[PDB]
Design a protein around this ligand. Structure first.
Ligand SMILES: [Zn+2]
Ligand SMILES: [Zn+2]
Ligand SMILES: [Zn+2]
Ligand SMILES: [Zn+2]
Ligand SMILES: [Zn+2]
Length: 521
């Protein structure tokens, strides 16, 4: 009931065994297995050679080169394509045919690490409580992951190819660790959720992926696909002195520039912003005609046989509303009708004055009755949540359902607070932190964490969140066009926790009324 040295495609790998409880359960922990060669700036990833003797996989390796919080310096390294594995172990014998869950972290495609914020992405609690293998890994972010010219000179999507190389590695190697290679589940959040979604839609992953979970992000969110990459490539070239005149000479120059200078070329200011934060998403995935062959809305046939959960947090837009409208935090300042109109008008520019007005009117319908500052502030949060997360997620749900063959579809809404649910509130419960650091959490927090892991890992095992090694508080009904049901996740769950048609008039507003209006110029 211990793996010892594991024979992988590159050679033997040695991790660490950690006993759990008194009876003799344990978990095998591997950190720092390479799945791809040290990266070359703006080039596609490539195989990692192979070692002799025994690779010791004891410590996390460096994340990929990215800007620090105060974007004055960088950390990480070009040699960052590493993954980490937790394998649970019972008392009798070594595990075999385990479901395998691969975590893709988020961070607006600008930041992140396999271990993550702090470690948050310690897979031990998912693996031991759900009885699954958890894989975490690094991929390239920022300009080094996503700089692109929009054509073959610099096709972008380097960070998405790194993700694909990790998934392919797991498929061909995870059996040696006790995993079922035909039963791989991707899950991820924010930028990671969008990436999970993009991986299911890419032809590159045919046959590799069995199921997927998108938390707070899908390939259809407006901050995912860069429609004018050449513009952002030219801002970076100017900042580092590359000649802008010609695409092919611009590409060749960019590939030779100091990767630290590429990373720090552009900075997202925090203090004073002209436009909403969405206008400043720069280095993100691109429709390249290769790894992403078309607009993601046209790719869902590739997910016909991939079971899919997608969901959002109650108040996912809160952090972005607070930045775009700082009067959301400080109760000293009123949120005014004039500020919301300005916000909304900046989100609806291609539909002009009439699209701003229709949107302002629907979202402020309820302001006549009790025009209090809490209802107004809630309205700004709901607007950002709708446009950035909820509406794209429901379009993805419907599109996945319409194209499904054998695939099941499921929707959730996470609403449990701890200070509803702000952005990335769900991660710590999904990863079992209320159990791994119990003093920092309340007993009700351990109640939500247990239920999410149970659903998530039941789904990993069978494609059905209700059926697996764990009991669940309430029956999660698959999503159909007819029932349009979602599970609402909270402290107290019973049969009423299955609801339907979340904020449906708004979904109808965005998908029928708003797009029916003429584009202007
Ligand atoms: Zn190496
Ligand atoms: Zn690190
Ligand atoms: Zn280096
Ligand atoms: Zn007014
Ligand atoms: Zn049912």
């Amino acid at each position: 009931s211990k793996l010892g040295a594991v024979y992988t495609e590159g050679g033997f790998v040695e991790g660490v065994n950690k006993k759990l409880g008194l009876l003799g359960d344990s978990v095998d922990i591997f950190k720092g297995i390479p799945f791809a060669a040290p990266t070359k700036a703006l080039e596609n990833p490539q195989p990692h050679p192979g070692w002799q003797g025994t690779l010791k996989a004891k410590n996390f390796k460096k994340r990929c080169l990215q800007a620090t919080i105060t974007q004055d310096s960088t950390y990480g390294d070009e040699d960052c394509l590493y993954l980490n594995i937790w394998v649970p172990q019972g008392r009798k014998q070594v595990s075999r045919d385990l479901p395998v869950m691969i975590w893709i972290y988020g961070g607006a495609f600008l930041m992140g690490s396999g271990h993550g914020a702090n470690y948050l992405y310690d897979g031990e609690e998912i693996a031991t409580r759900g009885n699954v293998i958890v894989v975490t890994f690094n991929y390239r972010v920022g300009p080094l992951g996503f700089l692109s010219t929009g054509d073959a000179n610099l096709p972008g999507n380097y960070g998405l190819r790194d993700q694909h190389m990790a998934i392919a590695w797991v498929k061909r190697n995870i059996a040696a660790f006790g995993g079922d290679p035909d039963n791989i589940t991707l899950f991820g959040e924010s930028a990671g959720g969008a990436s999970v979604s993009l991986q299911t839609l890419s032809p590159y992953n045919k046959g590799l992926i069995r199921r997927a979970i998108s938390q707070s992000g899908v390939a259809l969110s407006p901050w995912v696909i860069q429609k004018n990459p050449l513009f952002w490539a030219k801002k970076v070239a100017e900042k580092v002195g590359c000649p802008v005149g010609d695409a092919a000479r611009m590409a060749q120059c960019l590939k030779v520039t100091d990767p630290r200078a590429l990373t720090l070329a552009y900075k997202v200011p925090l203090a004073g912003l002209e436009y909403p934060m969405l206008h400043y998403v720069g280095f993100v995935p691109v429709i390249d005609g290769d790894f992403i062959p078309d607009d993601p809305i046209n790719l869902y046939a590739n997910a016909a046989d991939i079971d899919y959960i997608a969901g959002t947090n109650n108040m996912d837009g809160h952090i972005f509303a607070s930045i775009d409208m700082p009067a959301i935090n400080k109760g000293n300042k009123k949120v005014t009708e004039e500020d919301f109109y300005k916000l909304v008008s900046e989100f609806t520019i291609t539909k002009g004055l009439r699209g701003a007005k229709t949107t302002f009117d629907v979202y402020t319908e309820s302001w006549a009755q009790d025009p209090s500052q809490e209802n107004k502030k809630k309205t700004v949060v709901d607007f950002e949540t709708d446009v950035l997360f909820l509406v794209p997620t429901e379009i993805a749900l419907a599109q996945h359902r319409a194209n499904a063959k054998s695939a099941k579809t499921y929707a959730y809404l996470f609403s449990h607070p701890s200070r509803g649910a702000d952005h990335a509130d769900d991660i710590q419960y999904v990863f079992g932190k209320p159990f791994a650091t119990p003093t920092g959490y309340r007993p009700q927090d351990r109640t939500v964490s247990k239920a999410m892991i149970a659903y998530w890992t039941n789904f990993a095992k069978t494609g059905d969140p209700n059926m697996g090694d764990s009991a669940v508080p309430t029956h999660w009904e698959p999503y159909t066009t007819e029932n349009s049901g979602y599970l609402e996740i909270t402290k107290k769950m019973g049969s009423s926790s299955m609801k339907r048609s979340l904020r449906t008039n708004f979904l109808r507003y965005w998908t029928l009324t708003y797009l029916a209006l003429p584009t202007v110029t």
